[PDB]
Amino acid sequence: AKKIFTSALGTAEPYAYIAKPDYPRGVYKVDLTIPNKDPRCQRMVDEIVKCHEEAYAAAVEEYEANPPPYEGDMPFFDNGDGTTTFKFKCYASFQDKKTKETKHINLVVVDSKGKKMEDVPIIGGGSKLKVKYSLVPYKWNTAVGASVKLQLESVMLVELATFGGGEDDWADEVEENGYVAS
Amino acid sequence: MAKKIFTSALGTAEPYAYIAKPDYGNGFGNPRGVYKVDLTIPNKDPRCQRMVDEIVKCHEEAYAAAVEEYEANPPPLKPYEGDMPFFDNGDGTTTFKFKCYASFQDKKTKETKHINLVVVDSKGKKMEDVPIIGGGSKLKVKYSLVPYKWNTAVGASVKLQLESVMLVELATDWADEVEEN
Ligand SMILES: [Ca+2]
């Protein structure tokens, strides 16, 4: 069984796949950047670290008692600018293990009032969200060491970001031989 | 794992790179130190597009091989792709993520050794005392491509293994004084 954790309110990084998965088996995903000022930010980190140290401890405690170990990177990282980014992901499909078929799972997304949306807005970078998730410790492999996966369970869309209009939007509209910053 | 070596286009380093010294966050997990730099390159530089082509080709090739291997005897983990080690920033630039471990266990001798990352100036002169490379610095990097299969943690992708760095131009607040007192 899985215990549900809820993140602090954060800002979605670009390239989120919430309204639709990133497609091979699909994957929903969002990198959520939270201000370190939010105490919930440190608690999210503490929970993940605890999970890892306990699980890795156990993993080594059986590798050694029936072999055939190293640690990997945490699913979060302080950006050094007063914010920490957390990486959430979950598959878009699974195998009906009763009746064999592959089934598509849509990620539940709720608005700020808690209302589930059928037609989910595409979530652009800068959007404010809260996410519910599970901690899924995993063992070391040839690619990366043992760590924890923040398995996405659902998302609450708090603020939908505008597409365009900012600094980036202008990259596409440069003026030859014009004014240049100082 | 420095076999076929590629050279990046001239780019700009994102802040908090670890080139002059590695990142020993130890961040519990890989104790191993890590050298890393995120290099942002203008999309109109032709080498940028070629860099992407090469990574994508390496990925497609290795993923195709892994998939055929898996489908030849499906041994619950299905094939899937991870994120590429580069991303278009939507502003005419693309950021590439380079990294490598700061230590390794020797194959012949089994000795764990530390790796010093070679940094060269714009004319190829090895810099003996490497300056801390701040955000905004102009660099080129040498790297190898290390593809990897999908696993429980992440989907199949490619690591841009940092090999060495050329410092073309070194760039010139509140972190230290956080919260109270
Ligand atoms: Ca535009």
Swiss-Prot record, chain B:
Recorded superkingdom: Viruses
Keyword field contains Ribosomal protein: no
Entry keyword set: DNA damage, DNA repair, DNA replication, DNA-binding, Viral DNA replication
GO molecular function, one term: single-stranded DNA binding
Disulfide bridge map: none
BP term (GO), one: viral DNA genome replication
Record-stated family: Belongs to the Teseptimavirus single-stranded DNA-binding protein family.
Subunit structure: Homodimer. Interacts (via C-terminus) with the viral DNA polymerase. Interacts with the viral helicase/primase. Part of the replicase complex that includes the DNA polymerase, host thioredoxin, the primase/helicase and the single-stranded DNA binding protein.
Function: Single-stranded DNA-binding protein that participates in viral DNA replication, formation of concatemers, recombination and repair of double-stranded breaks. Coats the lagging-strand ssDNA as the replication fork advances and stimulates the activities of viral DNA polymerase and primase/helicase. Coordinates simultaneous synthesis of leading- and lagging-strands. Together with DNA primase/helicase, promotes pairing of two homologous DNA molecules containing complementary single-stranded regions and mediates homologous DNA strand exchange. Also promotes the formation of joint molecules.
Record remark: domains: The acidic C-terminus is involved in modulating the ssDNA binding properties. It is also required for dimer formation and for interactions with the viral DNA polymerase and the helicase.
Name of the protein in its database record: Single-stranded DNA-binding protein
Residues of the full protein shown: 1 to 197 of 232
